[PDB]
Design a binder for this molecule. Structure first.
Ligand SMILES: *[C@@H]1O[C@H](CO[C@@H]2O[C@@H](C)[C@@H](O)[C@@H](O)[C@@H]2O)[C@@H](O[C@@H]2O[C@H](CO)[C@@H](O[C@@H]3O[C@H](CO[C@H]4O[C@H](CO)[C@@H](O)[C@H](O)[C@@H]4O[C@@H]4O[C@H](CO)[C@@H](O[C@@H]5O[C@H](CO)[C@H](O)[C@H](O)[C@H]5O)[C@H](O)[C@H]4NC(C)=O)[C@@H](O)[C@H](O[C@H]4O[C@H](CO)[C@@H](O)[C@H](O)[C@@H]4O)[C@@H]3O)[C@H](O)[C@H]2NC(C)=O)[C@H](O)[C@H]1NC(C)=O
Ligand SMILES: *[C@@H]1O[C@H](CO)[C@@H](O[C@@H]2O[C@H](CO)[C@@H](O[C@@H]3O[C@H](CO[C@H]4O[C@H](CO)[C@@H](O)[C@H](O)[C@@H]4O[C@@H]4O[C@H](CO)[C@@H](O)[C@H](O)[C@H]4NC(C)=O)[C@@H](O)[C@H](O[C@H]4O[C@H](CO)[C@@H](O)[C@H](O)[C@@H]4O)[C@@H]3O)[C@H](O)[C@H]2NC(C)=O)[C@H](O)[C@H]1NC(C)=O
Lengths: 208, 207
């Protein structure tokens, strides 16, 4: 029969009060013969009725895909409430239930260090600016780069890696033209995480 | 019926002449009623005969596990030859064949940079020494830290990450007591990869 996948809000959405975090319930392999789908939503067991469901969408493998979106409160998600999606369909003997909640664990504050290019890399046309983010827990986190108040997006960030003390670390690498570095332009690594004060910190990096 | 899993050599094994790279053919769920297992091995379609096979070993679920190991030549593996394991068993309508080979794609040479701790971290009891390895392809690679003729224990390396130009990068983080760093000890990041000259390079870092 059909299948359900339940997805969390984005970390940045839960950590910045101005943004709009959502939980999303996706149902796939919904047949043409029985396309009717009912969603029930629960927060710590209590039904809520503010979910928005989008219309059937025919796939290329001749099935329907149907999506329901629940807006969540920032502080409910961060406080560990459980979000349950129940999907009912004529083709299901019993409805499918999926539950999701924030990654558990005692929070630990990321330490954020910026590292300039190696001298050896200055022979290249482009150089690497590095942000080390370590000692954090749980692993949900957002790391971004900017300069003069504007996003610098030519970067890649590693997945979180479990360290030997049970916390996580990652590195983000921003590539910039060497000339911008050598001209003394200032770059900053921004980190958003539940265990930071105001859920945000920034560290700068430039050539002296 | 029985099942076959074919495993490659470890990348480091293929890169250093001192080591012995092997391909391993394991067959599981071999029955008591039909316990006989025959291996045939091929390299680019040509049968080879120097594989070493171990005797059946009964498992706690009352089936046998039987392993055949083929030693490979380092340069054959790196040159992309294909290794085929054919497994024959009376309980099989037809023999099972599995094939394995090195990852494809144009190789690219890693660039290796060591980075000292940030000034802000020097207030801590332990500090982080960083090895950036970038611009490499394929993603198979070994990264190790040493100091004073001995490997270091407290390091972790990220998985390879696909960069915007289609090569990979990673970072390796070595944690040492601040005192060792301040005393001027030299640390070294060694990298082994098929696209390096002699498949090896090293970069050092000290205060
Ligand atoms: C017929 O076709 C359909 C769909 O059409 C195909 O789908 C695409 C992907 C291509 O493959 C093409 O072939 C077609 O277009 C098939 O539907 C697929 O079924 C799969 C199951 O058989 C299912 O696999 C599971 O994937 C999970 C991951 O899903 C992610 O990621 C995939 C790939 O990265 C992506 O395609 C999905 O869209 C989904 O992506 C996320 O979607 C959410 C929802 O919007 C995005 O939303 C953001 O998230 C939050 C929400 O609150 C936030 O608030 C934001 O507001 C919001 O924007 C989110 O951004 C997306 N993330 C990413 C990274 O993209 C896996 O987790 C899962 O594995 C786990 O479970 C398995 C089962 O137990 C385990 O084996 C496993 O170990 C794991 O535990 C599955 O592998 C596909 O997702 C699903 N595809 C779609 C589009 O729904 C259908 O199967 C097929 N039928 C037949 C018979 O062929
Ligand atoms: C009776 O008991 C038997 C022994 O206990 C059971 O045997 C087990 O059978 C299953 C399949 O039914 C096999 O599962 C496969 O494992 C592959 C990986 O195996 C490696 O890693 C596991 C986990 O650590 C380890 O136990 C294995 O021994 C093996 O280790 C590797 O061995 C090689 C060769 O010596 C060595 O070079 C490696 O270094 C070493 N690695 C490590 C980490 O130690 C999986 O990759 C297989 O995946 C298949 O299925 C996937 C499904 O998504 C698919 O994506 C893949 O592409 C692939 O098709 C597969 O899951 C077990 O390995 C096997 N155990 C042993 C010891 O052989 C037997 O099942 C049981 N029978 C019954 C009826 O109960």
């Amino acid at each position: 029969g059909p299948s359900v996948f339940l997805f969390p809000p984005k970390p940045k959405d839960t950590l910045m009060i101005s943004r709009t975090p959502e939980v999303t319930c996706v149902v796939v392999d919904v047949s043409h013969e029985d396309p009717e789908v009912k969603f029930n939503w629960y927060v710590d067991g209590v039904e809520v009725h503010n979910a928005k469901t989008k219309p059937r969408e025919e796939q290329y493998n001749s099935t329907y895909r149907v999506v329901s979106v629940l807006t969540v409160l920032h502080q409910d998600w961060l406080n560990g409430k459980e979000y349950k999606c129940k999907v009912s369909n004529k083709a299901l003997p019993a409805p499918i239930e999926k539950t999701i909640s924030k990654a558990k664990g005692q929070p630990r504050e990321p330490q954020v260090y910026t590292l300039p290019p190696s001298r050896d890399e200055l022979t290249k046309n482009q150089v690497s600016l590095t942000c080390l983010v370590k000692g954090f827990y749980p692993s949900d986190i957002a790391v971004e780069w900017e300069s003069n108040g504007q996003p610098e997006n030519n970067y890649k960030t590693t997945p979180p890696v479990l360290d030997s003390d049970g916390s996580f670390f990652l590195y983000s690498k921003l590539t910039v033209d060497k000339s911008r570095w050598q001209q003394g332009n200032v770059f900053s690594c921004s980190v958003m995480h539940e265990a930071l004060h105001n859920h945000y910190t920034q560290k700068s990096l430039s050539l002296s």
